[PDB]
């Protein structure tokens, strides 16, 4: 039912910068974390596929890694976030990846796709300054071999565009990187 995966990582500070009021734990993180692993089909995310109910016992061995790499950055309950991501996205690839394998896949993908690490050397790390879409995609392609998908958000008040997420696209095997085909960023953005 799926032809690929979108492995979506979020930049905590940027994500939380849009919540103009209230608390947001993401305001203090300094590394990219996991938003989700989304099975794809025909250029769109497959969602809410019939499948097994979320079962925390299937990933109990990964709780340390998941609390570190897949915390919620908006709320406080990490498990609630994992459950939601499984039911809305994970079920769509359960035909080949059971819950344990799906979450292990996301963890391995995160450990194998260190965004800041790939940008740091080329002086492209975050600093609240303007960055080039082609430059950033170029540095990530040079390091990982394929083009990532960049996701930006515009501040409703200043109209300034900020990088909020980076997508690594994978083939249906969930291991072979492929080029992403869409960005929601303009030629330049703050990072
Ligand atoms: N993007 C995002 N959503 C989160 C996070 N923690 C909890 N959520 C919740 O998960 C929803 C994301 O749904 P998704 O787009 O992954 O299907 C959000 O609307 C929000 O209510 C987080 O760290 N990032």
Curated annotation (Swiss-Prot):
GO terms for molecular function: ribonuclease T2 activity; RNA binding. The record marks 102-103, 106, 126, 128, 145, 163, 166, 191 as: Involved in thermostability. Disulfide bonds join 16-24, 49-92, 152-185, 169-180. RNA binds at residues 10, 35, 72-73, 75, 81, 84-85, 88-89. GO terms for biological process: RNA catabolic process. It catalyses: a ribonucleotidyl-ribonucleotide-RNA + H2O = a 3'-end 3'-phospho-ribonucleotide-RNA + a 5'-end dephospho-ribonucleoside-RNA + H(+). Changing residue 102 to A: Decreased thermostability (at 47-58 degrees Celsius). The keyword Transmembrane does not apply. Keywords: Disulfide bond, Endonuclease, Hydrolase, Lyase, Nuclease, Signal. Has a remarkably high specificity toward CpU, ApU, and UpU. This is Ribonuclease MC.
């Amino acid at each position: 039912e799926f032809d690929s995966f979108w492995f979506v990582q979020q930049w905590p500070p940027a994500v939380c910068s849009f919540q103009k009021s209230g608390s947001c734990p993401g305001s203090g993180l300094r590394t990219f974390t996991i938003h989700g692993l989304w099975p794809q089909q025909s250029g769109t995310s497959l969602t809410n596929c019939p499948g097994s109910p979320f079962d925390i016992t299937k990933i109990s061995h990964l709780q340390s890694q998941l609390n570190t790499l897949w915390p919620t950055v908006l709320r406080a309950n990490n498990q609630q976030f994992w459950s939601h991501e499984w039911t809305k996205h994970g079920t769509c690839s359960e035909s080949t990846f059971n819950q344990a394998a799906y979450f292990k896949l996301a963890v391995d993908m995160r450990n194998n796709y260190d965004i800041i690490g790939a940008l740091r050397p080329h002086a492209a790390g975050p600093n609240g300054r303007t960055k080039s879409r082609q430059a950033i995609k170029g540095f990530l392609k040079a390091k990982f071999g394929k083009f990532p998908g960049l996701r930006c958000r515009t501040d409703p008040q200043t109209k300034v565009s900020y990088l909020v997420e980076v997508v690594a696209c994978f083939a249906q095997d969930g291991s072979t990187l492929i080029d992403c085909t869409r960005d929601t960023c303009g030629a330049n953005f703050i990072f």
